[PDB]
Amino acid sequence: DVAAKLARSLASTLASSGVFRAAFNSRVSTPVAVQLTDALVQKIASNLGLDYATASKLRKASQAVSKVRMGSDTNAYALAISSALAEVLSSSGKVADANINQIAPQLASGIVLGVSTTAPQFGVDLSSINVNLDISNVARNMQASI
């Protein structure tokens, strides 16, 4: 399915992002990871211009993150978030084979930007990362993943 392809490629791309790895890793506590994901899905909806109903379903990513055990690696969080988002977007008619190559990098870029605009609310320091460059790299990393 498109959802499986989208989830797998997005997860690999997120795990390659310096911003994403700084926020989601073996040290983040679950309450923080969930609250960060809550804030993040609001940015995803704005960064992708999603309608109100689909936007409401994005919170499934927060529920998925809540089930990840603390101490799990970046890729565990990437997979939890990506599977939830891919399922929502496919089941809501926002992605198909005809446009997955467009949606996938747009979604990954919107997530990296969203994390960069929310992680400092939880004390995550991104000062050592060029966020502009990390977003710039999403396309090449997605090519590698997809």
PDB file of C-alpha atoms in Angstrom:
ATOM      1  CA  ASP A   1       0.000   0.000   0.000  1.00  0.00           C
ATOM      2  CA  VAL A   2       0.918   3.644  -0.408  1.00  0.00           C
ATOM      3  CA  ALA A   3       0.714   3.995   3.383  1.00  0.00           C
ATOM      4  CA  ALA A   4       3.406   1.379   3.934  1.00  0.00           C
ATOM      5  CA  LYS A   5       5.675   2.958   1.319  1.00  0.00           C
ATOM      6  CA  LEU A   6       5.122   6.417   2.789  1.00  0.00           C
ATOM      7  CA  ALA A   7       5.707   5.273   6.375  1.00  0.00           C
ATOM      8  CA  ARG A   8       8.947   3.437   5.567  1.00  0.00           C
ATOM      9  CA  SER A   9      10.451   6.250   3.489  1.00  0.00           C
ATOM     10  CA  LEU A  10       9.414   9.011   5.904  1.00  0.00           C
ATOM     11  CA  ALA A  11      10.801   7.130   8.908  1.00  0.00           C
ATOM     12  CA  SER A  12      14.209   6.634   7.288  1.00  0.00           C
ATOM     13  CA  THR A  13      14.296  10.312   6.282  1.00  0.00           C
ATOM     14  CA  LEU A  14      13.389  11.521   9.782  1.00  0.00           C
ATOM     15  CA  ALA A  15      16.025   9.263  11.347  1.00  0.00           C
ATOM     16  CA  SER A  16      18.585  11.027   9.101  1.00  0.00           C
ATOM     17  CA  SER A  17      17.594  14.533  10.291  1.00  0.00           C
ATOM     18  CA  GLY A  18      19.848  16.180  12.863  1.00  0.00           C
ATOM     19  CA  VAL A  19      16.861  18.131  14.199  1.00  0.00           C
ATOM     20  CA  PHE A  20      14.724  15.021  14.581  1.00  0.00           C
ATOM     21  CA  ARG A  21      17.527  13.047  16.239  1.00  0.00           C
ATOM     22  CA  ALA A  22      18.133  15.896  18.702  1.00  0.00           C
ATOM     23  CA  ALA A  23      14.483  15.794  19.829  1.00  0.00           C
ATOM     24  CA  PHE A  24      13.609  12.072  19.667  1.00  0.00           C
ATOM     25  CA  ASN A  25      16.262   9.716  21.041  1.00  0.00           C
ATOM     26  CA  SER A  26      17.008   7.300  23.875  1.00  0.00           C
ATOM     27  CA  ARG A  27      17.076  10.133  26.433  1.00  0.00           C
ATOM     28  CA  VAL A  28      13.720  11.820  25.801  1.00  0.00           C
ATOM     29  CA  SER A  29      11.100  11.122  28.442  1.00  0.00           C
ATOM     30  CA  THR A  30       7.712   9.878  27.278  1.00  0.00           C
ATOM     31  CA  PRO A  31       5.694  12.854  28.617  1.00  0.00           C
ATOM     32  CA  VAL A  32       8.009  15.182  26.709  1.00  0.00           C
ATOM     33  CA  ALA A  33       7.938  13.085  23.538  1.00  0.00           C
ATOM     34  CA  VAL A  34       4.119  13.064  23.621  1.00  0.00           C
ATOM     35  CA  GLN A  35       3.796  16.788  24.332  1.00  0.00           C
ATOM     36  CA  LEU A  36       6.331  17.517  21.611  1.00  0.00           C
ATOM     37  CA  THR A  37       4.396  15.344  19.154  1.00  0.00           C
ATOM     38  CA  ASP A  38       1.150  17.146  20.104  1.00  0.00           C
ATOM     39  CA  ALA A  39       2.741  20.494  19.271  1.00  0.00           C
ATOM     40  CA  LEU A  40       4.361  19.026  16.171  1.00  0.00           C
ATOM     41  CA  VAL A  41       1.144  17.739  14.598  1.00  0.00           C
ATOM     42  CA  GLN A  42      -0.315  21.247  14.788  1.00  0.00           C
ATOM     43  CA  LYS A  43       2.673  22.516  12.802  1.00  0.00           C
ATOM     44  CA  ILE A  44       2.329  19.637  10.313  1.00  0.00           C
ATOM     45  CA  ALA A  45      -1.282  20.626   9.654  1.00  0.00           C
ATOM     46  CA  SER A  46      -0.251  24.247   9.069  1.00  0.00           C
ATOM     47  CA  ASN A  47       2.862  23.374   7.042  1.00  0.00           C
ATOM     48  CA  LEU A  48       0.812  21.116   4.723  1.00  0.00           C
ATOM     49  CA  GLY A  49      -2.431  23.139   4.704  1.00  0.00           C
ATOM     50  CA  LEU A  50      -4.581  20.182   5.782  1.00  0.00           C
ATOM     51  CA  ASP A  51      -8.344  20.385   6.308  1.00  0.00           C
ATOM     52  CA  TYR A  52      -9.843  20.379   9.804  1.00  0.00           C
ATOM     53  CA  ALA A  53     -10.939  16.720   9.856  1.00  0.00           C
ATOM     54  CA  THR A  54      -7.634  15.300   8.625  1.00  0.00           C
ATOM     55  CA  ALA A  55      -5.764  17.632  10.974  1.00  0.00           C
ATOM     56  CA  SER A  56      -7.738  16.195  13.901  1.00  0.00           C
ATOM     57  CA  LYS A  57      -6.647  12.647  12.979  1.00  0.00           C
ATOM     58  CA  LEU A  58      -2.953  13.581  13.086  1.00  0.00           C
ATOM     59  CA  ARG A  59      -3.057  13.224  16.889  1.00  0.00           C
ATOM     60  CA  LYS A  60      -2.851   9.476  16.287  1.00  0.00           C
ATOM     61  CA  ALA A  61       0.889  10.174  16.085  1.00  0.00           C
ATOM     62  CA  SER A  62       0.851  11.330  19.710  1.00  0.00           C
ATOM     63  CA  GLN A  63      -0.943   8.151  20.766  1.00  0.00           C
ATOM     64  CA  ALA A  64       1.657   6.054  18.929  1.00  0.00           C
ATOM     65  CA  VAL A  65       4.511   7.939  20.626  1.00  0.00           C
ATOM     66  CA  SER A  66       2.851   7.440  24.041  1.00  0.00           C
ATOM     67  CA  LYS A  67       3.253   3.655  23.589  1.00  0.00           C
ATOM     68  CA  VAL A  68       6.993   3.797  22.739  1.00  0.00           C
ATOM     69  CA  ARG A  69       9.063   2.784  25.763  1.00  0.00           C
ATOM     70  CA  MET A  70      11.504   5.355  27.147  1.00  0.00           C
ATOM     71  CA  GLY A  71      15.043   4.546  26.088  1.00  0.00           C
ATOM     72  CA  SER A  72      13.954   3.702  22.561  1.00  0.00           C
ATOM     73  CA  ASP A  73      16.159   4.994  19.754  1.00  0.00           C
ATOM     74  CA  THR A  74      15.411   7.794  17.301  1.00  0.00           C
ATOM     75  CA  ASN A  75      14.271   5.306  14.659  1.00  0.00           C
ATOM     76  CA  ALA A  76      11.607   3.900  17.002  1.00  0.00           C
ATOM     77  CA  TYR A  77      10.041   7.356  17.304  1.00  0.00           C
ATOM     78  CA  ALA A  78      10.473   7.979  13.576  1.00  0.00           C
ATOM     79  CA  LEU A  79       8.639   4.733  12.786  1.00  0.00           C
ATOM     80  CA  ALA A  80       5.846   5.348  15.322  1.00  0.00           C
ATOM     81  CA  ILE A  81       5.170   8.871  14.041  1.00  0.00           C
ATOM     82  CA  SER A  82       5.577   7.992  10.367  1.00  0.00           C
ATOM     83  CA  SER A  83       3.274   4.965  10.446  1.00  0.00           C
ATOM     84  CA  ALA A  84       0.560   6.967  12.218  1.00  0.00           C
ATOM     85  CA  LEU A  85       0.809   9.912   9.807  1.00  0.00           C
ATOM     86  CA  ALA A  86       0.973   7.731   6.689  1.00  0.00           C
ATOM     87  CA  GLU A  87      -2.123   5.815   7.793  1.00  0.00           C
ATOM     88  CA  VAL A  88      -4.027   9.071   8.429  1.00  0.00           C
ATOM     89  CA  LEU A  89      -3.000  10.626   5.119  1.00  0.00           C
ATOM     90  CA  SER A  90      -3.821   7.515   3.082  1.00  0.00           C
ATOM     91  CA  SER A  91      -7.140   6.857   4.823  1.00  0.00           C
ATOM     92  CA  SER A  92      -8.088  10.534   4.336  1.00  0.00           C
ATOM     93  CA  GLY A  93      -7.323  10.534   0.607  1.00  0.00           C
ATOM     94  CA  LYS A  94      -4.329  12.871   0.779  1.00  0.00           C
ATOM     95  CA  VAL A  95      -1.704  10.526  -0.717  1.00  0.00           C
ATOM     96  CA  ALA A  96      -1.766   7.925  -3.506  1.00  0.00           C
ATOM     97  CA  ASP A  97       0.718   6.382  -5.938  1.00  0.00           C
ATOM     98  CA  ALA A  98       0.110   9.390  -8.214  1.00  0.00           C
ATOM     99  CA  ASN A  99       1.495  11.898  -5.680  1.00  0.00           C
ATOM    100  CA  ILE A 100       3.532   9.995  -3.053  1.00  0.00           C
ATOM    101  CA  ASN A 101       6.772  11.269  -4.592  1.00  0.00           C
ATOM    102  CA  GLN A 102       5.534  14.834  -3.904  1.00  0.00           C
ATOM    103  CA  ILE A 103       3.850  14.331  -0.538  1.00  0.00           C
ATOM    104  CA  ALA A 104       6.695  12.355   1.007  1.00  0.00           C
ATOM    105  CA  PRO A 105       9.419  15.065   0.887  1.00  0.00           C
ATOM    106  CA  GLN A 106       6.907  17.831   1.625  1.00  0.00           C
ATOM    107  CA  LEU A 107       5.737  15.986   4.732  1.00  0.00           C
ATOM    108  CA  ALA A 108       9.299  15.224   5.849  1.00  0.00           C
ATOM    109  CA  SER A 109      10.322  18.866   5.402  1.00  0.00           C
ATOM    110  CA  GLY A 110       7.251  20.025   7.309  1.00  0.00           C
ATOM    111  CA  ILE A 111       8.052  17.668  10.194  1.00  0.00           C
ATOM    112  CA  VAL A 112      11.681  18.795  10.457  1.00  0.00           C
ATOM    113  CA  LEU A 113      10.579  22.435  10.438  1.00  0.00           C
ATOM    114  CA  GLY A 114       7.822  21.614  12.925  1.00  0.00           C
ATOM    115  CA  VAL A 115      10.256  19.944  15.317  1.00  0.00           C
ATOM    116  CA  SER A 116      12.627  22.902  15.027  1.00  0.00           C
ATOM    117  CA  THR A 117       9.798  25.296  15.987  1.00  0.00           C
ATOM    118  CA  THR A 118       8.598  23.206  18.954  1.00  0.00           C
ATOM    119  CA  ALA A 119      11.550  21.353  20.496  1.00  0.00           C
ATOM    120  CA  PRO A 120      12.872  24.500  22.297  1.00  0.00           C
ATOM    121  CA  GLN A 121       9.627  24.523  24.324  1.00  0.00           C
ATOM    122  CA  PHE A 122      11.071  21.415  26.016  1.00  0.00           C
ATOM    123  CA  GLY A 123      14.633  22.665  26.392  1.00  0.00           C
ATOM    124  CA  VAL A 124      16.003  20.924  23.290  1.00  0.00           C
ATOM    125  CA  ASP A 125      18.941  22.972  22.025  1.00  0.00           C
ATOM    126  CA  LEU A 126      19.298  23.199  18.252  1.00  0.00           C
ATOM    127  CA  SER A 127      21.985  25.930  18.261  1.00  0.00           C
ATOM    128  CA  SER A 128      24.630  23.528  16.929  1.00  0.00           C
ATOM    129  CA  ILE A 129      22.426  22.518  13.961  1.00  0.00           C
ATOM    130  CA  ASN A 130      21.885  24.651  10.874  1.00  0.00           C
ATOM    131  CA  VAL A 131      18.147  24.069  10.644  1.00  0.00           C
ATOM    132  CA  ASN A 132      17.981  25.561   7.144  1.00  0.00           C
ATOM    133  CA  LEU A 133      20.599  23.067   5.939  1.00  0.00           C
ATOM    134  CA  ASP A 134      18.915  20.157   7.728  1.00  0.00           C
ATOM    135  CA  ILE A 135      15.661  20.969   5.913  1.00  0.00           C
ATOM    136  CA  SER A 136      17.641  21.396   2.681  1.00  0.00           C
ATOM    137  CA  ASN A 137      18.981  17.834   3.071  1.00  0.00           C
ATOM    138  CA  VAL A 138      15.504  16.270   3.358  1.00  0.00           C
ATOM    139  CA  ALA A 139      15.154  15.819  -0.414  1.00  0.00           C
ATOM    140  CA  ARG A 140      18.416  13.880  -0.809  1.00  0.00           C
ATOM    141  CA  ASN A 141      17.766  11.816   2.311  1.00  0.00           C
ATOM    142  CA  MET A 142      14.249  11.001   1.084  1.00  0.00           C
ATOM    143  CA  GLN A 143      15.634   9.939  -2.303  1.00  0.00           C
ATOM    144  CA  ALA A 144      17.926   7.577  -0.408  1.00  0.00           C
ATOM    145  CA  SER A 145      14.999   6.301   1.656  1.00  0.00           C
ATOM    146  CA  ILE A 146      12.451   6.037  -1.169  1.00  0.00           C
TER     147      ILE A 146
END
